[PDB]
Design a protein around this ligand. Structure first.
Ligand code: FES
Lengths: 40, 95, 103, 27, 89, 115, 171, 159, 156, 26
């Protein structure tokens, strides 16, 4: 649901498309060391 | 085989249960299920249905605040429809 | 009156966008029931177990028969008589001895 | 079998999308 | 911790703090005459609700309400900050 | 079908926002339906075009041969004109490219919300 | 929050008693609402196996109103199970024989076709008139607004309303 | 009655009732006033237990102190090592909550958890339907698993 | 308006109350047109209907009212529905000399297109593909404004 | 087929609505 509205705003209809939620890393080390890039 | 078949339908059944509980909770606050989801999407809120059920059960005060946000966006959405688009975007409708 | 939902039942809802606008903040202090809108404790000066025993009174033929006993039990709990009937040994043994309990 | 309202709208959308395909294939 | 007579203990703490003993009131009730009754009893101090507890009977509800106040008195609220095992010091 | 269908009108240009001059170069085509229960010629064209997977982005030229092939499979595809607001990507920025649903291929991804 | 486990479970799983007025109210709309309340669908945590149904009390069923000519056109069919045991009765005749029968039948049909329906019917209380036992009132927790807003009659209209209403034409 | 006057009636007006939103200028003042109080609340640390919603993998996990989360895949991280989750959309306090749009700023919220165990999934039975199924057409699924323990949730008054 | 007084009998024509001044839409041929009420009245609007109805519930002649035929049919249907719904207690039929009504319980009904007397029961309801439909409402009021997403279900 | 029936409905012409009916015309 909401795909039409997301397209109206210029966002991907499916939240799983191009977006910070999917593209950005999902975690990092507690020490602060950056996590390795996701294989996907 | 029955267990293997049950794997696919089990996930679908769980999603149906989550939606039903949300609808019951939303109607208690006077908000229909489609309106709540659409308003949350318009608010750039990406909570999943399972978590939505969880917040209502254990965070009723937060859920009421969430209901107000959906209701407030709905009020702005109604105003935008009545405005016909000439009016600027609402304070809570800014993206 | 900025809040779009009544604040009188559950808690006061204060909705406020952050100055940067990246966050939505909800303040939800709880609201207590007004004193004038509550009832006092019963002024007149009995345990529920006694009431339950009284409800299932033994009046006729000393202890009543199983059927009437089930009917009396069914009436109290607004259930059907079928629920109260026992079950055979086969299923009774099948019942799990140590069911898991979490929270 | 009377046609449901939903079905009619879906067919119209497909025709409209195909019309856009025609235009972008016209240049 | 085993706490008997919570109502008396709650009053004992309140008098130490120079606070009036709460006046019990029935905030909410459901199925009073049924075999499954629910009673909500709130302890009102100076006409102000301090703690409310649920119970099947008024005595149980009052006892439960007192238990809630004792936790609040000692700062043992369910939403209280969790203890810290993080500290390396 | 008469050729007039593929002859655009000034109103059509405004509706689709396509300039009759400087026509778009590249087509964006995605398969949205199944080829099952379809005649062999339709199946062959889809395989030749490479649209085996549904909702799969494909870059193709707006040339008569491609245009003729696309017309055969028109009903099973969605055609969008590619747009390059920032121009063609460079070799260094080839790893920073990103195609939006609007049809714009940005050559630099700054990980900042458009808002 | 901060409540003991067992009291919290008791309160959450407790059953509520509701009162409904059927005077000049369509049973079908009431039945839909009644099914929601009876089955326990009015709770946010409703579950199929939690037995969370609630008690529903309906009064003034004698004065229900049926839209259109459903009074004379709606026929209820039942079979005794013996040869020639087919019985067809109009809605008006059924109401005359029993005012509460129509409401019960509609609710029963609307309810799910499962074993739990019979238990739900036990929790349902239907009163032909306003009379209710006092203990039920004590059990009653809340009353529900009538589903249908009742139109006013000419006599019911206020004198001030008549003055406000203009005369469209002059006889 | 003036020209083109329609008195309100059942069909003259819609069932819904029009409303008027508050003026923005005063409403913006209300926004700041709430924020100022909230910033003091965060600064004063007037909160106890907190709950945070974190999106990991393809799932959203509501988190609280002492919570245990199982991830059905390997993570490549040694057990007993604390790790920070970077995607948090919501955090809750005793009387206030913060909602991301769709995510909060990294400065505001920092969440750390530790890996407890690396494990696999108990066997799962897969059997496709076919005529003459036979008993030997069986496959087992033992996909990997990992265990995480929530350690700390940190917030600051950085509004 | 002529009234007869009573052998010698004499009849006097009396002045009639006038419509409210300044109709919302002057130049309208019919009063409904004059008042912009074409698609905004229903049988529940007894106040408007009562103006065109005799004291005992009889329909007034169209010529006297002056409204167009389309509204006449709509108003007549609306009035009939109100009578069948018992919404006109002061316009009930006249008792000739001393007659009294059925003196039996009266069933509450509304939205009744036809008289309950002349509608026979539907014994065979029908299956999914043979289900019988029961008309609700009046076709004459199709043009009335609807505030629902889809047109109302005339046939139940 | 169901789809064929949809086409028949589409062929139905959409007429505009006149402002005022002839009887209620000025
Ligand atoms: S509204 Fe003008 S003639 Fe009927």
């Amino acid at each position: 649901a909401g795909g039409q509205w997301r397209l109206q705003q210029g966002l991907a209809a499916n939240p799983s498309g191009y977006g910070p939620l999917t593209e950005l890393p999902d975690w990092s080390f507690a020490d602060g060391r950056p996590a390795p890039p996701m294989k996907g | 085989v029955k267990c293997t078949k049950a794997r696919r339908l089990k996930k679908r059944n769980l999603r149906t249960l989550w939606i039903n509980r949300i609808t019951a909770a939303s109607q208690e606050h006077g908000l229909k299920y489609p309106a709540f989801i659409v308003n949350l999407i318009k608010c750039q809120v990406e909570l999943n249905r399972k978590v939505l059920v969880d917040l209502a059960i254990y965070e009723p005060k937060t859920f009421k605040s969430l209901a107000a946000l959906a209701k407030r966006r709905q009020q702005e959405g109604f105003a935008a429809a009545l405005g016909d688009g000439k009016e600027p975007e609402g304070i809570f409708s800014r993206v | 009156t900025y809040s779009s939902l009544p604040d009188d039942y559950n808690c006061q809802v204060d909705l406020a966008l952050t100055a940067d606008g990246r966050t939505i903040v909800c303040y939800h202090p709880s609201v207590d029931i007004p004193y004038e809108h509550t009832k006092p404790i019963p002024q007149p000066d009995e345990t529920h177990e006694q009431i339950l025993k009284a409800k299932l009174e033994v009046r006729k033929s000393k202890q009543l028969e199983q059927g009437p006993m089930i009917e009396q039990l069914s009436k109290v709990f607004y259930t059907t008589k079928h629920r109260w009937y026992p079950h055979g040994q086969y299923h009774n043994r099948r019942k799990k001895l140590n069911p898991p309990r979490d929270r | 079998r009377t046609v449901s309202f939903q079905a009619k709208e879906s067919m119209i959308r497909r025709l409209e999308v195909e019309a856009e395909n025609h235009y972008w294939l016209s240049m | 911790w085993t706490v008997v007579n919570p109502m008396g203990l709650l009053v004992e703490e309140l008098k130490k703090r120079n606070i009036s003993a709460p006046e019990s009131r029935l905030t909410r009730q459901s199925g009073s005459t049924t075999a499954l009754p629910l009673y909500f009893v709130g302890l009102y101090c100076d006409r102000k609700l301090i703690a409310e507890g649920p119970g099947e009977t008024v005595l149980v509800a009052e006892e439960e309400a007192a238990r809630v106040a004792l936790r609040k008195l000692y700062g043992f609220t369910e939403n209280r900050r969790p203890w810290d095992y993080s500290k390396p010091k | 079908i008469p050729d007039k269908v593929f002859q655009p009108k000034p109103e059509d240009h405004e509706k689709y926002g396509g300039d009759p001059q400087n026509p778009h170069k590249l087509h964006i085509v995605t398969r949205i339906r199944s080829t099952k229960r379809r005649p062999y010629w339709e199946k062959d064209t889809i395989k030749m075009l490479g649209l085996q997977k549904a909702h799969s982005p494909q870059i193709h030229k707006n040339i008569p041969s491609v245009n003729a092939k696309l017309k055969v499979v028109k009903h099973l595809i969605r055609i969008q004109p590619l747009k390059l607001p920032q121009g063609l990507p460079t070799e260094e920025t080839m790893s920073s490219t990103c195609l939006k649903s609007t049809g714009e291929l940005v050559v630099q991804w700054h990980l900042k919300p458009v808002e | 929050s901060s409540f003991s486990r067992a009291p919290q479970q008791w309160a959450t799983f407790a059953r509520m008693w509701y009162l409904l007025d059927g005077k000049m109210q369509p049973p079908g709309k009431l039945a839909v609402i009644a099914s929601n309340k009876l089955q326990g669908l009015n709770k946010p945590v409703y579950h199929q196996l939690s037995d969370c149904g609630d008690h529903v009390v309906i009064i003034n069923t004698r004065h229900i109103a049926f839209s259109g000519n459903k009074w004379e056109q709606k026929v209820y069919s039942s079979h005794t199970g013996y040869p020639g045991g087919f019985r067809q009765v109009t809605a008006a005749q059924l109401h005359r024989k029993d005012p509460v029968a129509i409401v019960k039948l509609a609710i029963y049909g609307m309810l799910p076709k499962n074993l739990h329906r019979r238990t739900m019917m036990q929790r349902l209380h239907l009163f032909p008139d306003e009379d209710i036992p006092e203990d039920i009132l004590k059990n009653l927790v809340e009353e529900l607004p009538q589903p249908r807003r009742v139109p006013k009659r000419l006599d019911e209209y206020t004198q001030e309303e008549i003055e406000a209403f203009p005369r469209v034409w002059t006889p | 009655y003036p020209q083109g006057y329609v008195p309100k009636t059942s069909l003259s007006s819609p069932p819904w009732q029009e409303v008027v939103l508050p003026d923005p200028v005063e409403e913006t003042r209300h926004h700041a006033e709430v924020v100022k109080r909230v910033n003091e609340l965060i600064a004063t640390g007037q909160y106890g237990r907190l709950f945070a919603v974190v999106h990991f993998a393809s799932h959203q996990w509501k988190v609280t102190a002492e919570d245990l989360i199982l991830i059905e895949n390997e993570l490549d991280i040694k057990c007993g090592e604390r790790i920070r989750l970077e995607k948090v959309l919501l955090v809750g306090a005793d009387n206030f909550t913060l909602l991301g749009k769709p995510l909060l700023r990294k400065e505001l919220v920092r969440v750390e958890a530790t890996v407890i165990e690396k494990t696999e999934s108990w066997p799962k039975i897969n059997m496709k339907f076919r005529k003459r199924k036979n008993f030997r057409k069986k496959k087992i699924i033992v996909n990997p698993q990992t265990i995480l323990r929530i350690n700390t949730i940190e917030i600051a008054p950085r509004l | 308006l002529r009234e007869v007084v009573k052998t010698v009998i004499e009849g006097r024509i009396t002045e009639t109350p006038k419509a409210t001044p300044d109709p919302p839409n002057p130049s309208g041929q019919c009063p409904i047109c004059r008042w912009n009420l074409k698609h905004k009245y229903t049988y529940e609007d007894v106040l408007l209907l009562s103006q065109f109805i005799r004291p005992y519930g009889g329909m007034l002649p169209r010529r006297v009212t002056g409204l167009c035929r389309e509204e006449h049919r709509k108003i007549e249907e609306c009035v009939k529905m109100a009578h069948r719904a018992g919404l006109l207690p002061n316009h009930r039929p006249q008792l000739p000399e001393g007659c009294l009504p059925k003196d039996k319980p009266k069933l509450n009904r509304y939205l009744t297109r036809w008289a309950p007397k002349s509608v026979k029961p539907i014994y065979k309801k029908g299956h999914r593909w043979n289900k019988v439909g029961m008309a609700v409402g009046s076709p004459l009021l199709k043009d009335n404004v609807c505030y629902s997403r889809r047109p109302l279900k005339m046939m139940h | 087929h169901f789809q064929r029936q949809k086409l028949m409905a589409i062929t139905e012409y959409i007429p505009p609505k006149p402002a005022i009916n002839p009887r209620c015309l000025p």
